[PDB]
Amino acid sequence: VGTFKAKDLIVTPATILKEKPDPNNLVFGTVFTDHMLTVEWSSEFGWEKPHIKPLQNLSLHPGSSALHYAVELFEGLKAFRGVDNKIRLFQPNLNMDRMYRSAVRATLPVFDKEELLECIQQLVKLDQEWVPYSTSASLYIRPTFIGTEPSLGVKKPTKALLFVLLSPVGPYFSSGTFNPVSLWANPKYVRAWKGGTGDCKMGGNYGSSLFAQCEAVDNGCQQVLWLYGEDHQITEVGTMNLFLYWINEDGEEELATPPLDGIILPGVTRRCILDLAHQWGEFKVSERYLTMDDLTTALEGNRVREMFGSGTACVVCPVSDILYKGETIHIPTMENGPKLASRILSKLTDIQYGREERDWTIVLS
Amino acid sequence: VVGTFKAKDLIVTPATILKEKPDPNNLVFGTVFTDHMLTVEWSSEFGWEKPHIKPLQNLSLHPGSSALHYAVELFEGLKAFRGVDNKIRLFQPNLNMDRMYRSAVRATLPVFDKEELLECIQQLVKLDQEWVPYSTSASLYIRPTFIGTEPSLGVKKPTKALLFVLLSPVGPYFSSGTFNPVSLWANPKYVRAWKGGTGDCKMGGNYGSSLFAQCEAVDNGCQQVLWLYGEDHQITEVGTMNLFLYWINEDGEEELATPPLDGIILPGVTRRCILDLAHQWGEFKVSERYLTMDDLTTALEGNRVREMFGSGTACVVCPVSDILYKGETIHIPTMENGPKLASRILSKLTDIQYGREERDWTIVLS
Ligand SMILES: CCCc1cc(=O)n2nc(NCc3c(F)cc(Cl)cc3F)c(C#N)c2[nH]1
Ligand SMILES: CCCc1cc(=O)n2nc(NCc3c(F)cc(Cl)cc3F)c(C#N)c2[nH]1
Ligand SMILES: *Cc1c(COP(=O)(O)O)cnc(C)c1O
Ligand SMILES: *Cc1c(COP(=O)(O)O)cnc(C)c1O
Ligand SMILES: [Mg+2]
């Protein structure tokens, strides 16, 4: 039981460097930088020294448990080139906390969160010219942790690989504006269950999503609204946390989001939005159950203001419609500004690009 | 695009150095691999490439491959058996091809021609046929595997995939080669699968989530997990195996019971074979029915339980001796009852697998 250390980094620079992309023509998660971080683990010898080396294919035994039994987890965070040309990470300690917690739940080996964050800092530093020269683009950082056990028994792995990829990305939507989405709400598909891994960023949570999203697209919708339970609770939207801004049953202005009862991924963006809403103290902030009946009752009383997803790749993604029980239900998000969604995006973007000082950002090592 | 690969297009790159075969008595499940593997690449742009049989070697995967990030992956498990007549047989391999195809559609992995995949698997086993053990208690495990190799990090249907097949010689699941009854850990805190989920498919995402509960079982002195579901603590599966209960039921009737295929149970090939045999014998009631922990503890207090066992490909029939539940150890008298039915099932399935009797369930290697 132990950790790799950043002071042990072995750095092998690429001798052929790739052209950087146009920061205005960027598709999320498609372009990769020159270098990656890799760290090997075995039960026999523990953590090997960490390597920063050229981006390359992984060489994996075909029996590797990541390939058979989804022994795998990941993270997602961003580096931003500030208005002052200082590169900043955003809330990276929250990602290290979540990745450590996911590793325990996956039965992958633990590591020192500060050692991994310093290894990520050194990788971004080497590839810093990849952090785009744009106030609407960023560098996506993908820490990934896989079982590489070369045996077909279903068991805790005795071999693993932790690696980090970098990808320059633009706005999630090419327009760089709000592209409000239609949601497909079919209770036939359930993303997560009590006693499952839905509250960890484990790869096994995401395999089911593709089929339901393909069905959404066949029915003229862009994303899945994940429903849970006999009362059709609204939980998450695609790969994003779900917020509802409304007048509640008590006549109170409220920002509501489902609570962390085991079927909700505790998003870093979700945490930030709840912290902002509590700080502003302008309306009620509630982690509470929201059902489709709660929503349709509110819509018929003109009580709904905004619905939006939260997540790293999109930040704030408004919802305009839900298809449920054969009816298209309009959500008036875009007819209400969307004032709160816009205020949140502006605040987070100002912090990310260093337009205001914050404890939420760390300058590049 | 090429809609499916064909076996007639197989490219064979033989290994030039062959490995020493293992002792068929000293085999740990899924640890030893044969000389060759099958690989077939797919892209949305061009469809399926030609299939390759080549030496076992590492895969070269883009680190963004969706199998590694979002568990875009599934597998199968089936066996080849060297008969008492030295003919190698497969056991209902078309059921595995059907299950794998159905899982691929649910995963959004590309379709393939099930007959062409089975012919490629036959050619791979034929090349590595000396790996099929010279033992009536050992077999060759076949692991078809299908992974998303999409390099991009969006959560989306893959535009690149790899279908591959590994072979692994395996002995009895336990080195003793006799029944090693297990103790089960029953904790309703963890759930394997749920209604609206993918528990009825061999998708890798069903297994990664299970390891934590298995580790908790082991540190509480148990070998396997009894998977509970719902407010009434339905008993569903035992480890990675289907669950059978042989008992006198609530109505006083001798009964072999197993949970029903309601979407949270893997539809095991061994499970369906056991139900088919039990219906054919007609010596007791055969029921696909819900079973709860209360049903089981009530039966045990009434001395109504005869045998409990798992069914699956790697073990065939795996008896259960004990369950740890609500802080108490509950003895299951499987081994004090022979176990007569478990032994009879094992003997019948092994007689079919090793060609001691003719069966529509076996196919001789082409
Ligand atoms: C898994 C981590 C990487 C990642 C991959 C991926 O494919 N997506 N897609 C995202 N947004 C699509 C989307 C939308 F555009 C709108 C709504 Cl309401 C809901 C929604 F999910 C986001 C985000 N944020 C994201 N992140
Ligand atoms: C996933 C497919 C490959 C595979 C991997 C693996 O680790 N196992 N372990 C198995 N048997 C352990 C076990 C037991 F020994 C006894 C009982 Cl009651 C329940 C049980 F699961 C079996 C079987 N059959 C199996 N198959
Ligand atoms: C990552 C993730 C979230 C939250 O994303 P953040 O980028 O941490 O805000 C929500 N739901 C799912 C399924 C996720 O994978
Ligand atoms: C593979 C598997 C079984 C057994 O299926 P067979 O086709 O008999 O090998 C049972 N339960 C689970 C969860 C499985 O993965
Ligand atoms: Mg054909």
A66 to chain B, any CB pair closer than 8 A? The answer is: yes
Query: How deeply is A332 buried, as exposed, middle or buried, from its count of CB atoms within 10 A (0-12, 13-18, 19+)?
Result: middle
Question: Technique behind this structure?
Answer: X-ray
Cβ of B270 closer than 6 Å to ligand 4, yes or no, is: yes
Cβ of A167 closer than 6 Å to ligand 1, yes or no, is: no
Q: Contact, B70 vs A203, CB < 8 A? A: yes
Between the CA of residue A182 and those of A215, A299, A328, B85, what are the distances in Å?
13, 16, 9, 63
Q: Contact, A158 vs A42, CB < 8 A? A: yes
What tokens were used for B2? 């090429």
The ligand whose atoms approach the alpha carbon of B115 most closely is 5
CA–CA min distance A32, chain B (Å):
9
What tokens were used for A242? 């779900």
User: How far apart are the C-alpha atoms of B74 and B67, rounded to whole Å?
Assistant: 9
Are β-strands B234-238 and B224-229 bridged in parallel, bridged antiparallel, or unpaired?
antiparallel
Beta-carbon contacts of A52 under 8 Å, excluding residues fewer than 6 positions away, are A9, A10, A11, A12, A35, A36, A37, A119, A122, A123, A126
Between the CA of residue A311 and those of A78, A113, A201, what are the distances in Å?
11, 22, 13
Q: Give the domain B182-353 fold.
A: D-amino Acid Aminotransferase; Chain A, domain 2 (3.20.10)
CB-side exposure of A24: number of CA atoms within 13 Å? 0
CB-side exposure of B179: number of CA atoms within 13 Å? 27
Element spanning B277, H or E: helix B269-281
End-to-end CA distance of chain B: 29
User: Per the CB < 8 Å rule, is B68 touching A204?
Assistant: no
Are β-strands B59-61 and A58-60 bridged in parallel, bridged antiparallel, or unpaired?
antiparallel
CA–CA min distance A329, chain B (Å):
23
Architecture, CATH, for domain A6-170: 2-Layer Sandwich (3.30)
Of the candidates B56, B155, B194, which has its C-beta nearest A206's C-beta? B155
Resolution (A): 1.6
3 state DSSP class of B363: strand
CATH class of B7-171: alpha beta
User: How far apart are the C-alpha atoms of B143 and A262, rounded to whole Å?
Assistant: 33
User: How far apart are the C-alpha atoms of A264 and A191, rounded to whole Å?
Assistant: 10
Q: Which residues in chain A are closer than 8 Å to B104, comparing Cβ atoms?
A: none
DSSP code, position B267? -
Q: Which of A138, A165, A239 to mutate to test the pocket of ligand 1 (most atoms within 8 A of CB)?
A: A239
Q: Which of B242, B243, B274 to mutate to test the pocket of ligand 4 (most atoms within 8 A of CB)?
A: B242
Beta bridge partners of A42: A46, A159
3 state DSSP class of B205: helix
**Domain locations in chain A as residue ranges:** 6-170, 181-352
What tokens were used for A250? 């008590």
Residue with tokens 């008992």: B247
Q: Contact, B247 vs B306, CB < 8 A? A: yes
Q: Which residues in chain B are closer than 8 Å to A208, comparing Cβ atoms?
A: 197-198, 203, 205
3 state DSSP class of B192: coil
Of the candidates A61, A154, A213, which has its C-beta nearest B207's C-beta? A154
Q: What is the 3-state secondary structure (H, E, C) of chain A?
A: CCCCCHHHCEECCCCCCCCCCCCCCCCCCCCCCCEEEEEEEECCCEECCCEEEECCCEEECCCEHHHHCCCEEECCEEEEECCCCCEEEECHHHHHHHHHHHHHHHCCCCCCHHHHHHHHHHHHHHCHHHCCCCCCCEEEEEEEEEECCECCCCCCCCEEEEEEEEEEECCCCCCCCCCCEEEEECCCCCCCCCCCCCCCCEHHHCCCHHHHHHHHHHCCCCEEEEEECCCCEEEEECCEEEEEEEECCCCCEEEEECCCCCCCCCCHHHHHHHHHHHHHCCCEEEECCCEHHHHHHHHHCCCEEEEEEEECCCEEEEEEEEEECCEEEECCHHHHCCHHHHHHHHHHHHHHCCCCCCCCEEECC
CATH 3.40.50.10470 holds for A181-352? no
User: How far apart are the C-alpha atoms of A182 and B43, rounded to whole Å?
Assistant: 29
What tokens were used for B119? 């012919």
Between the CA of residue A75 and those of A53, A163, A164, what are the distances in Å?
20, 11, 9
